[PDB]
Paper text:
We present a robust protocol based on iterations of free energy perturbation (FEP) calculations, chemical synthesis, biophysical mapping and X‐ray crystallography to reveal the binding mode of an antagonist series to the [name] adenosine receptor (AR). The first integrated approach of ligand and residue FEP simulations was published by Boukharta et al. to characterize antagonist binding to the Y1 neuropeptide receptor, which we later expanded to other GPCR families, including the related neuropeptide receptor Y2,12 the orphan receptor GPR13913 and several members of the family of adenosine receptors. Among the latter, the adenosine [name] receptor (A2AAR) was one of the first GPCRs to be crystallized and today stands out as one of the better characterized GPCRs from a structural perspective. Many A2AAR antagonists have been developed targeting a number of pathologies, including recent clinical candidates in immuno‐oncology. In the same HTS campaign, a series of chromones were identified as a novel family of A2AAR antagonists, and consecutively optimized to yield the potent and selective Chromone 14.30 At that point, the lead‐optimization program was successful in improving the affinity of the initial HTS hit, while not focusing on pharmacokinetic optimization (i.e., the most potent compound Chromone 14 contains a metabolically unstable ester group).
Subsequent X‐ray crystallography of the A2AAR with a low and a high affinity chromone derivative confirmed the predicted binding orientation. The structures were obtained following the in meso soaking approach, and could be refined down to a resolution of 1.92 and 2.13 Å respectively. The two structures show clear positive omit density at 1σ for the presence of the chromone compounds in the orthosteric binding site, in both cases adopting binding mode A. The structure with the high affinity ligand 4 d shows outstanding agreement with the computational model with an RMSD of 0.67 Å between the docked and experimental poses, and is indeed highly similar to previously reported binding modes of the compound. The core of the scaffold is anchored by an H‐bond between the nitrogen in the 4‐methylthiazole ring (coplanar with the chromone scaffold) and N2536.55, and complemented by a π‐π stacking with F168EL2, in line with the binding pattern observed for many other A2AAR antagonists. The ester at position R7 is stabilizing the Glu1695.30–His2647.29 ionic pair, which closes the EL2‐EL3 interface, while the propyl at R6 makes contacts with Tyr2717.53 and Met2707.52. Given the good resolution of the structure, we could observe a well‐defined water network of the interface between the carbonyl moiety of the chromone core and the receptor. While most water positions are conserved as compared to the A2AAR‐ZM241385 complex, ligand 4 d displaces a number of water molecules observed in the first hydration shell around that ligand.
Numbering used by the authors: 0 to 208, 1001 to 1042, 1062 to 1106, 219 to 305
Write the structure that this text describes.
């Protein structure tokens, strides 16, 4: 069949994707700009990512449509049209990695997060990452290309002019660059690193939330030990342990009271007065009920929110991998298996479209998983 028919479907689909990528991502950018509760370091990378997606719609998609035609062009101009999407993908990878790291810093060392991760450091990092993205993505423009070996038969058949080639992705971009440099080195490795960071984030969270329960359990069991003791020494044992575990957990009024009360009881227990120390240890229950238990519930609630936010970020990264992998895998087959028939055109189109679809998905994930974005989206849309 005439190429314009299958080309028509592909183009239409690309155009639809472009519209959706632009709309959703402009909305993300708008939400961050308007809502000061969304203005934080994590979200600056979210905006960088959104910008990359906007550019997929504005530029990468129109470029992809263009290159699908195999139009006559100067080889280097053709390279730009072919590789610009790689710049966008690379930037996305950097943003994704930054978000994972940012969340790891928040969970591992929350006391030092604000002084370490600032808005100014973030903007500089974003700038650097875009520069690096251009370098990586446009590496073929620096000389790793097939412009030195033009397919002159193909160019002459299409009536191309001198110094021009039929602009086709696989004719100008070397597959070794695509597979070894782009896929393995610049996409695969960072994604694996991201996986590693997420694993550490979830482990740190799981460990902290066990530790909170342990401390609590230690306060309750040592209380019971004090109640059932027969001598001062047993009481002194259980309170010394308790004092250590009160401080660990406090590493304000309520904890001052708690430690003070343990000290009261300990002094009584060091004087041999068992019954008085036990009654004194009983007052600890009042401090636990109205102070310590509230600290435990808030600390646990803060951790769960961090796990929820980390899962939301991980999903985004997972989705990027899912959307891009098929295309990369196809490139691997093309490159590693020259005896294998090339993947059919329809599959190529499908793989490309899927890759482009990744630029649509983030706004939905934010809307469904993050309440503050969702509420802001509604307001923007309502207003
Ligand atoms: C990342 C997840 C979703 C897995 C996706 C795997 C996809 C990309 C895999 C699964 C089966 C694969 C195909 C298996 C057989 C062939 C025949 C060969 O002549 C060309 C490549 C081609 C057509 C492969 C292209 C890539 C392929 C379609
Ligand atoms: C953790 C995962 C997602 C990383 C990506 C796995 C990739 C690199 C793997 C998965 C399936 C693999 C392919 C499976 C089969 C063939 C056909 C063979 O004639 C050449 C290698 C080739 C083409 C492999 C290249 C590498 C490959 C594409
Ligand atoms: C999923 C992750 C861990 C990657 C898995 C990669 C696997 C599928 C890759 C790695 C090395 C690859 C093999 C390397 C060499 C050859 C010789 C070639 O004449 C036929 C394909 C064959 C036999 C490949 C089949 C696919 C292969 C086994
Ligand atoms: C949603 C996404 C904006 C500015 C220009 C857009 C127009 C871009 C398209 C212009 C293409 C012109 C063209 O290809 O002309 C070929 C020539 O006529 C054959 O010899
Ligand atoms: C030649 C054809 C291609 C050219 C196409 C134009 C080039 C677009 C490139 C980069 C824009 C990147 C924008 C990144 C926006 C993120 C900014 C941000 O997040 O702000 C942080 C905040 O200011 C902290 O206080
Ligand atoms: C923003 C939109 C960008 C679309 C960019 C599309 C670039 C269109 C190039 C088409 C072109 O230059 O065709 C003329 C002919 O091939 C020369 O001999
Ligand atoms: C980053 C590392 C992760 C995955 C690499 C997977 C390695 C895939 C290696 C494929 C090698 C291969 O296919 O060799 C066949 C050879 O060309 C005979 O014709
Ligand atoms: C079908 C339309 C033109 C075309 C495009 C590309 C393309 O954009 C990529 C890419 N890979 C990545 C990781 C980013 S972009 C790979 O192979 C292609 C092959 C193509 O044409 C073929 C199959 O011969
Ligand atoms: C997501 C939606 C996927 C549907 C269509 C993607 C484009 C498929 C184009 C088919 C072209 C057939 C051909 O030219 O051989
Ligand atoms: C295309 C790139 C658009 C960049 C949008 C920046 C929005 C600023 C912000 O939300 O802080
Ligand atoms: C919208 C993207 C613009 C597509 C232009 C393709 C031109 C190809 C050609 O001139 O043959
Ligand atoms: C709005 C954009 C609509 C049409 C422009 C895209 C079509 C450009 C010519 C493609 C020809 C081809 O696919 O061979
Ligand atoms: C914030 C946006 C940052 C953009 C900075 C641009 C950095 C450019 C760095 C490397 C890209 C090199 C591409 C070479 C183009 C060759 C063009 C030609 O053929 O003349
Ligand atoms: C750093 C800068 C590296 C990019 C320098 C410009 C590359 C131009 C390549 C070319 O025109 O062939
Ligand atoms: C590889 C390993 C992957 C690890 C991933 C790491 C994360 C874990 C035109 C239409 C216009 C109308 C618009 C709509 C109007 C309403
Ligand atoms: C719908 C999604 C289809 C995805 C994978 C199916 C594999 C397609 C392979 C068919 C091409 C094989 C060939 O003839 O070269
Ligand atoms: Na992206």
């Amino acid at each position: 069949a005439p190429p314009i028919m299958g080309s028509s479907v592909y183009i239409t689909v690309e155009l639809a994707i472009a519209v959706l990528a632009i709309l959703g991502n402009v909305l993300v950018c708008w939400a961050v700009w308007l809502n000061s509760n969304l203005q934080n370091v994590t979200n600056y990378f979210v905006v960088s990512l959104a910008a990359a997606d906007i550019l997929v719609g504005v530029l990468a998609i129109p470029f992809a449509i263009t290159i699908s035609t195999g139009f006559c062009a100067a080889c280097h101009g053709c390279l730009f049209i072919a590789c610009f999407v790689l710049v966008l993908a690379q930037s996305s990878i950097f943003s994704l990695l930054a978000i994972a790291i940012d969340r790891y810093i928040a969970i591992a060392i929350p006391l030092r997060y604000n002084g370490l991760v600032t808005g100014t450091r973030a903007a500089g990092i974003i700038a650097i990452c875009w520069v690096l993205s251009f370098a990586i993505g446009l590496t073929p423009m620096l000389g790793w290309n097939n412009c030195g070996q033009p397919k002159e038969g193909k160019a002459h058949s299409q009536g191309c002019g001198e110094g021009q080639v039929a602009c086709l992705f696989e004719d100008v971009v070397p597959m070794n660059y695509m597979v070894y440099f782009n896929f393995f080195a610049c996409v695969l490795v960072p994604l694996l690193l991201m996986l590693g960071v997420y694993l550490r984030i979830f482990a740190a969270a799981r460990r902290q939330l066990a530790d909170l329960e342990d401390n609590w359990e230690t306060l309750n069991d040592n209380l019971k030990v004090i109640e059932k003791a027969d001598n001062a020494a047993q009481v002194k044992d259980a309170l010394t342990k308790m004092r250590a575990a009160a401080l660990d957990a406090q590493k304000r009024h309520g904890f001052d009271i708690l430690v003070g009360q343990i000290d009261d009881a300990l002094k009584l227990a060091n004087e041999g007065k068992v019954k008085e120390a036990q009654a004194a240890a009983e007052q600890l229950k009042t401090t636990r009920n109205a102070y310590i238990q509230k600290y435990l519930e808030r600390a646990r609630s803060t951790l769960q929110k961090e796990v929820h936010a980390a899962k939301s970020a991980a999903i985004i990264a997972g989705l990027f991998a899912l959307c891009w992998l098929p295309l990369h895998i196809i490139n691997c087959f093309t490159f590693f298996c020259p005896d294998c028939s090339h993947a059919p055109l329809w599959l190529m189109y499908l793989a490309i479209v899927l890759a482009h679809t990744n630029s649509v998905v983030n706004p939905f994930i934010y809307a469904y998983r993050i309440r503050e974005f969702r509420q802001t989206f509604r307001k923007i849309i309502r207003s």
